[PDB]
Nucleic acid binder design. Sequence first.
DNA 1: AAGTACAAACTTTCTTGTAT
DNA 2: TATACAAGAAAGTTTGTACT
Lengths: 66, 64
Amino acid sequence: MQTLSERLKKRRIALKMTQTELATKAGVKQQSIQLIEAGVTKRPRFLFEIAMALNCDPVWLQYGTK
Amino acid sequence: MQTLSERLKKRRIALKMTQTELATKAGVKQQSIQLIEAGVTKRPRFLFEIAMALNCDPVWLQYG
DNA sequence: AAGTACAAACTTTCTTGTAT
DNA sequence: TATACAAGAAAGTTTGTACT
């Protein structure tokens, strides 16, 4: 009953990644990862480019489990 | 194929729907979809939703 | 009518700059 | 070195309509 911001952290934290390694594995600016993480951004448009970076299912990041 | 556009049309039609029909099930605006196929929307926000009306795969729909 | 396009307005996301 | 906040610019979505 998670947020997307919660999945980004746990994931990015578990791949032991800074917000700038992730921000950049995925070609983003770190400030963009932050926002998603902040609860600020809710439908990142780079949701696929970043899942690649986190190596996770885009649909899981975006939406949760069941 | 190519572009998101090429992939979006083909399949709409082939699914046999119209912008307004899709868009109404993707449940966005006929217009949002016009811009996509039109090649102006490079990265939909309703993509899991569009693609899910068309009934496929977002990755597949987005890219391939 | 039926189906698709075209355009400003309004919104959400991503960046250019620091601050902490 | 890592993360966070603030305006504004870019990408998308709606609102409204014109054309075939």
